[PDB]
Amino acid sequence: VNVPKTRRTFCKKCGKHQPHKVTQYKKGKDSLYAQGKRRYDRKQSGYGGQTKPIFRKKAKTTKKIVLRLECVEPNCRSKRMLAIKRCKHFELGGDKKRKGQVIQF
Amino acid sequence: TNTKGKRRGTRYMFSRPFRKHGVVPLATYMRIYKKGDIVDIKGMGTVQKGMPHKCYHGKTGRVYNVTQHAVGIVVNKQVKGKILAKRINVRIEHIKHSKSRDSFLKRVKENDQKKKEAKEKGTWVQLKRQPAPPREAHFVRTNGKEPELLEPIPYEF
Amino acid sequence: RRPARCYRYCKNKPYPKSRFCRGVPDAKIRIFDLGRKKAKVDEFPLCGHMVSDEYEQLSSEALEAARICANKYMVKSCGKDGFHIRVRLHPFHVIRINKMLSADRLQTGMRGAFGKPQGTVARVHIGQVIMSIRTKLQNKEHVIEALRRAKFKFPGRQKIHISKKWGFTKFNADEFEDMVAEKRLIPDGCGVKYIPNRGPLDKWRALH
RNA sequence: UUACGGCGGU
RNA sequence: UGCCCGGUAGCCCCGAAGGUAGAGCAGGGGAUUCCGAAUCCCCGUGUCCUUGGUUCGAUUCCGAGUCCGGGCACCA
RNA sequence: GCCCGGAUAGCUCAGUCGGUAGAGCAGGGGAUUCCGUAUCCCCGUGUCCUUGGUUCGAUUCCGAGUCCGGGCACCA
RNA sequence: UUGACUGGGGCGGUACACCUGUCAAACGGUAACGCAGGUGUCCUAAGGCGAGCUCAGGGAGGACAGAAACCUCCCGUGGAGCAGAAGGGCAAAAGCUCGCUUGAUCUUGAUUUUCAGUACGAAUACAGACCGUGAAAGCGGGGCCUCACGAUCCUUCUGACCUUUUGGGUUUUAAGCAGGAGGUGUCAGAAAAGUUACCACAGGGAUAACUGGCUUGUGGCGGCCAAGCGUUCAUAGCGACGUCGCUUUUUGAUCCUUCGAUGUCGGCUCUUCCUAUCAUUGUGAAGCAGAAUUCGCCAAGCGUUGGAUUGUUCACCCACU
RNA sequence: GGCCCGCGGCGGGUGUUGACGCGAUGUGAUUUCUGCCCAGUGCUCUGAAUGUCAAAGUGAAGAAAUUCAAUGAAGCGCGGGUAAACGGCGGGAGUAACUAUGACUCUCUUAAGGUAGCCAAAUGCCUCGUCAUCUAAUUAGUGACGCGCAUGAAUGGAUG
RNA sequence: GACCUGGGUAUAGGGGCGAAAGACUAAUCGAACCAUCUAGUAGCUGGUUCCCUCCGAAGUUUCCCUCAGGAUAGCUGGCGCUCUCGCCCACGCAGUUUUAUCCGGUAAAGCGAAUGAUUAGAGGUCUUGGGGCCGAAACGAUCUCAACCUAUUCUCAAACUUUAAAUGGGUAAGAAGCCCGGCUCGCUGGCGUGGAGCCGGGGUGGAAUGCGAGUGCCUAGUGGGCCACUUUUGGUAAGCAGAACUGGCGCUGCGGGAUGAACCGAACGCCGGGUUAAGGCGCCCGAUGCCGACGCUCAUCAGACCCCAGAAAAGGUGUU
RNA sequence: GUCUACGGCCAUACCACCCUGAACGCGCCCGAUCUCGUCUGAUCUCGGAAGCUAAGCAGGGUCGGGCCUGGUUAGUACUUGGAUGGGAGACCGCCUGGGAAUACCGGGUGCUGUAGGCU
């Protein structure tokens, strides 16, 4: 899967099609002091051991890659998300293929 | 077990019949479907965009909704122990006019007017239809000849 | 090889050698005409069929032993190259074997029970011909005795029928010489090419 | 510092 | 789950940081010896796992995007 | 008494790139030397298991039969 | 704590979620550890539109050039291609080449498919924006269609000049609201290694290890046909290639009875029965001179042993008969 | 101090003890031998050689909660040792003047490739192995043989 | 003698003690005994107490660490309620037919029609593959197998098909229908266009047969099924495993099949008379104790009545 | 009696070969300066009007091949329902109602809509 560096799509902050910067999304730092982390840290304290299920029986090998579309025109600067059907290998700006190659493996 | 897929048992029925392949006749699209037109469903195989399902092919419904390229049809579906008024959006290539009421529409037109012919002429025409009656006592004629004597042929292989 | 009582009466829907089967051995019959195959139409006037009485399966291997039994007999009195035996039904139905214990319960039970191909048989209908020979009209009693010895190698019941046709053709032998004579039939080897009166007129000019 | 062999009969 | 290393001639391995691709092995030849054996020498053998980047060209020099092999963490 | 790879010169064996049947032991003939040993070279010897199919092409691919060895092995 | 399905369980396998052809008995629906296969992807083009073109193949020609290069003409209803498993579809095309593009965007409902007529997923017809393409009609909100995927709780990011942060203000922070993702392949979604011959409990003939019953592949025993064997000569004795049965002394297939129990190998001991006859009685036939043998018939009256090895049934050997 | 008890105490046991002792294992008299492997699993040992690594403390940014950086105990990783520690002791190629085999040579896997002995053994599936002996007759017994399914050295080997 | 024993003493339950057998620890030990928590839990067994009347099942759908169990729909009962017929036309409905009109790819058939298999000869010739000769040599000249093509011919297909049934499936067979007049629209747009909607007016007898319907709530049991026609899958077959349609058994007695779950008749309040069905009528055993009809058959193993309980190929100058 | 433009139904319209074609039309044709597009004015696009029905096109023909339609095949093959029918079975016959397919034989071969012109 190859999806380019730039893209003209709809942004809701003004309501037009206008170009964007598209980059791969990463999950971000799992912050302390969230409500389900403040809850989990007091339940797991004390005696009793592991108190909620730790999942281990993993089956899928890919992820739905999602893209962050940052609106390029100034004083908007408004981001969003967009998904693609899942894939293994993800390139962003890799040399659009021509249909007249001599493949030669 | 049995692969509950859309378009599953239609190896033959979502096909064009034989030597009627290719692109469609254009009077399929120049049909006029109003509300309450009784239409029947026969899904073709060339247009993929609006074929109904393999449960409505060969059934007959009635138009409740008309849009640019399709028609909402309310049909009855036999599910296990009850039948269901179901409403499907079907594109216009997959249907045609049901001629099942069109032999009723003549004998409401030429029945209402023949009713008022008996009011000007004064009779009791009995415009209701009857089934095929038992045959009238007719009279057969063997003029000239005499009947033919036939007999069963012998067995030879 | 199991007895032919097991592989008899037509029970399964017909299962031929195709890209779905791919594991079937060869039939023991591979030649089907064994007299003088080169003969013309008028060289052997009469024919005699053997005809099935019941709807059963005859194995490919039984059809071998029958045609050997008839080709052996007819070189003895009718002589070599004085007849034309043709075995007409071809074995296309593949029978299967559930080859268990491949003395143990150890392989399976009835668990994976769809078997492997094991032979070929021919599904025969009531009134369908099996073998057919054609000879001179002088050798008519040798037709029956050749087919009489052949029917002891088949299961079931067969009747032997001296036909009303001219050889292996489809036209009746009473008017065959009456009607090959003028134009309507032309002989091409061991068969007859019927010519209608509806083609181009040029081939009618090529005739006469 | 390392230097091992040399067919048989004449 | 992020941190920390390593990737080559036909196989092991030299370095190497801004200036060339090198010990041994195997192959092919010579030389040495009266002759073999050992021995010496020479050839041929290289997008360094692959995409870029300043300086001054660039496998390195640089940390990045990649794949193979190994790290200690663990809430759907 | 079910399965996996093999059927090839006198033997034995690899490869039978979908395009020749070629190492090697045994015999033959030379050459070699004073004469022999060993040697070295040349000549012989292939239904490439049987039949059918797949391209100016099949022993070689595909799968049918026959054969030869080599093997899945529960609680009761 | 130690998954389930399962012609007992185990081992194996996935019939555990999904797709195509068949089964399937011409609407739909329809099973088995039934048949033949496939799936956990891949694609910024293989998506969108518009234009131009025609495919596999074959023939006849053309320097090398030959079965296979390229060029040209002719024929060519799809015999090719359309990412892939199949089926359906497709010719100024849905294929092939080229030119612009991002509609593979934003948002509300309705409907179909599975169905309880719930959900996810997939799909359809719209409606409202904003766009692309084309001269335009139009077409397009992913792949020509049928498959390609995932709840709550939690995490994370994004969105509005938003709400709540508890006596009132300001600011961080925290909690909300809306929708993308981080998973549950046992795929409507628990967080999981054995062993027990020291074992235990509640059960189960819904469920194996005996007998019995059905079946008779396999074993055993026969019949028919007769190319050959037998110096000659099919049939004295045999008998290939077939093909038709019987028997339940073998082995299996089955799971009907029995799990609040039918004492489970062999030997010993003893009785009776069957004939598919080894011997003995009476016979018939021989490739029956005698003798010795063989093949049949009425025939179960009467006999059918002694030991070495082995738990053996079985096997094998010695000796008598 | 070692090995242990113990809810608790610097409480108890060995201990009224001290290496000819106490504690923990293995093998099993005598005679005779105890081969080769430190890769794996343990055990152990060492140098601010060094990667990873928690609190507390240090520094920075901030209105503060907090955030971030630095620094780095044991442990693991790395390196050495150890098999009378648990264990392991297979293949493949060449090679002798008949064939066969391989004293010799070279490799892989993974460290090393079963030495001395012993055997159809209470350990050998095939198997009632083969040969000799014992019996008229032996799936028995004994003695030999030995690419031994799957023998073997303190899992002790062989004796007597 | 690492000897045997008395009494005293010490060790106490996840502990003791063991020359080791998981031995012994008060007839109890692979974790004692006693009391309690405690009437511990059980998707698993066994039991579950009066009568009569009326109605009457299900073993299937989907989901579940689901498969001996539940939730869900279906089948059931009870409670009603809204109404319709009471006295030239039924509101309505139907496991039915008719009248039309659609739909479909199975049986069959077909392959001298496509795809895929497949046998045989004939005719023709570009040829190469290989032979036969005129011959130094010459696609100068003359034949054969093959291959190729053409016209035929034998045999087939669950996953092939032009054609294509029978049974089947849908719809329609009027008043909610038909016709006319006008007016709203922000939809559509050459147009008093098109289409929807609203109002008003006019004419009801519109296939056959049968029948009272409509509607809501509450709801138990069930969630192992089994058999037979016919249709079919795996299997050599099975009183075998698994489906389709209908009827049965389970829940059901009775008459016949000697006997019996399911076969054939027929379904059941308590009796009297009459008649029958299936089946029978020598004697058990009611009924041929008819002056029944016509033939076939002799067995030293006769034969004798759906399911159903015993036989094949082959053979007989045995009789017809 | 035909044609052109646009169509409908999509072979009775196709395919192969062969004859005829008045008049208008449709075409072949003749040329690249602009519009445009190519390796190439062949195609496509653009300017023409000296020729020609040679081709396409239109009519007709062929004991034509296909296609369409009807006979035979055939009340056949199958099939609804039924029987204490037959047969060891495999299968068969009857009752009750429906009811095909090829070989073979024959007959056909475009029909029309709106707008416009020739005759």
Ligand SMILES: [Mg+2]
């Ligand atoms: Mg009945």
Ligand SMILES: [Mg+2]
């Ligand atoms: Mg130009």
Ligand SMILES: [Mg+2]
């Ligand atoms: Mg230009």
Ligand SMILES: [Mg+2]
């Ligand atoms: Mg021009």
Ligand SMILES: [Mg+2]
């Ligand atoms: Mg012309």
Ligand SMILES: [Mg+2]
């Ligand atoms: Mg002309």
Ligand SMILES: [Mg+2]
């Ligand atoms: Mg014509």
Ligand SMILES: [Mg+2]
């Ligand atoms: Mg014709």
Ligand SMILES: [Mg+2]
């Ligand atoms: Mg019927």
Ligand SMILES: [Zn+2]
């Ligand atoms: Zn913006």
